[PDB]
Amino acid sequence: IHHHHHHKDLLGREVEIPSNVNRIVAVGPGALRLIAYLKATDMVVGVEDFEKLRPYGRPYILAYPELKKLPSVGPGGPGKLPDLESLITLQPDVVFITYVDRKTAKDIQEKTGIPVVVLSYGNLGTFEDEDLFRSIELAGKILGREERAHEVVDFIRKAQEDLVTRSEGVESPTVYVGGIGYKGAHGIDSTEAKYPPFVVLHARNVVDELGEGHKFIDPEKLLVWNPEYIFIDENGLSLVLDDYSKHREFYESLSAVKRGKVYGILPYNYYTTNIGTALADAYFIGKVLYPERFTDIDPEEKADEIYEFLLGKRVYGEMAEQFGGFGKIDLPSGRILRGTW
Numbered sequence: 001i002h003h004h005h006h007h008k009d010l011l012g013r014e015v016e017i018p019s020n021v022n023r024i025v026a027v028g029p030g031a032l033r034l035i036a037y038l039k040a041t042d043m044v045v046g047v048e049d050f051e052k053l054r055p056y057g058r059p060y061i062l063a064y065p066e067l068k069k070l071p072s073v074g075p076g077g078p079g080k081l082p083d084l085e086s087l088i089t090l091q092p093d094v095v096f097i098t099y100v101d102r103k104t105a106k107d108i109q110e111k112t113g114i115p116v117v118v119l120s121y122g123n124l125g126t127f128e129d130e131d132l133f134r135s136i137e138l139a140g141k142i143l144g145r146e147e148r149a150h151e152v153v154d155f156i157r158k159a160q161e162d163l164v165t166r167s168e169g170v171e172s173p174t175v176y177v178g179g180i181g182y183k184g185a186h187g188i189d190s191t192e193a194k195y196p197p198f199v200v201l202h203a204r205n206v207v208d209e210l211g212e213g214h215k216f217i218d219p220e221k222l223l224v225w226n227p228e229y230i231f232i233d234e235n236g237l238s239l240v241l242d243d244y245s246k247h248r249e250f251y252e253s254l255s256a257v258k259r260g261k262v263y264g265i266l267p268y269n270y271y272t273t274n275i276g277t278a279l280a281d282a283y284f285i286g287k288v289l290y291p292e293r294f295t296d297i298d299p300e301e302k303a304d305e306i307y308e309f310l311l312g313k314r315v316y317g318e319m320a321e322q323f324g325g326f327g328k329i330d331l332p333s334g335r336i337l338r339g340t341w
């Protein structure tokens with residue numbers, strides 16, 4: 001008879017787990033990311049095929065590439081469940097899972113005989129979701145990473161506070177973000193209302209009239225909104241560039257284009273939120289909109305400070321090689337002018 005504890009997961013399920021935890025699996029969008037942030041990668045005994053098959057957009061897998069070599073626990077990806085026989089064979093002490101319901105968690109736990117803990121990123125429209133922080137704390141307790149959990153959450157909270165502080169009292173310019181991935185890549189018409197990097201900087205997002213979350217808009221409305229600054233999420237950059245080449249007159253009529261105020265940002269939404277990348281993007285956008293309040297911030301160095309803290313490796317360079325990196329975009333050539341704002 002070994003010592004156990006009872007843990008209340010993000011669905012309010014009480015789960016009994018031995019206190020001695022050494023072997024884990026993390027499945028569903030962003031579950032493995034949180035384990036990476038908690039420095040518990042060496043406990044991971046199986047991995048979704050997704051990590052190797054879809055290699056881009058995720059700092060954690062660039063920081064911990066050895067995870068790709070572990071035995072399969074299933075395909076992964078959105079809407080997939082782990083392979084139960086793989087779980088039974090690997091016998092982790094606990095399975096962490098995201099984006100499932102109680103029925104599903106119960107079924108996996110009962111069929112495998114392995115404790116299942118549901119984690120949650122909660123609302124993706126904020127840097128301070130309490131379910132996300134709770135998830136980090138809870139996995140921290142279960143994994144013996146409690147101090148590290150507090151540190152991760154505090155880092156995120158302080159970054160939010162710092163961005164608010166730096167932006168306090170400045171006039172808010174009009175802005176737009178396009179190119180946002182949403183079940184596939186999209187171009188200029190794919191945006192977001194209540195976009196967290198904008199919201200923390202109180203930027204006047206021209207689509208915020210639409211409410212919150214992902215939006216597809218009529219790009220003719222851009223001609224009326226005429227945002228002072230345009231940010232292109234680099235998951236959609238190729239599509240935007242192709243659109244530009246086909247519709248040069250449309251784009252050249254926008255004041256953002258006229259003034260060279262079109263910039264590339266790194267994608268952060270791949271397999272739910274890459275929190276480091278989202279924060280790095282907010283520092284880059286802040287420097288662009290409010291340069292006097294960011295004179296001490298080199299956005300590329302800051303991205304690597306973030307990644308080094310959360311993931312222990314300076315992966316910005318690899319991200320910039322995948323997507324382009326931070327800088328003004330020259331729409332005719334498709335080049336990113338790195339080190340510009």
Ligand SMILES: [Cl-]
Nearest residue numbers: 274275276277
């Ligand atoms: Cl990240």
Ligand code: NI
Nearest residue numbers: 004005006016
């Ligand atoms: Ni008990």
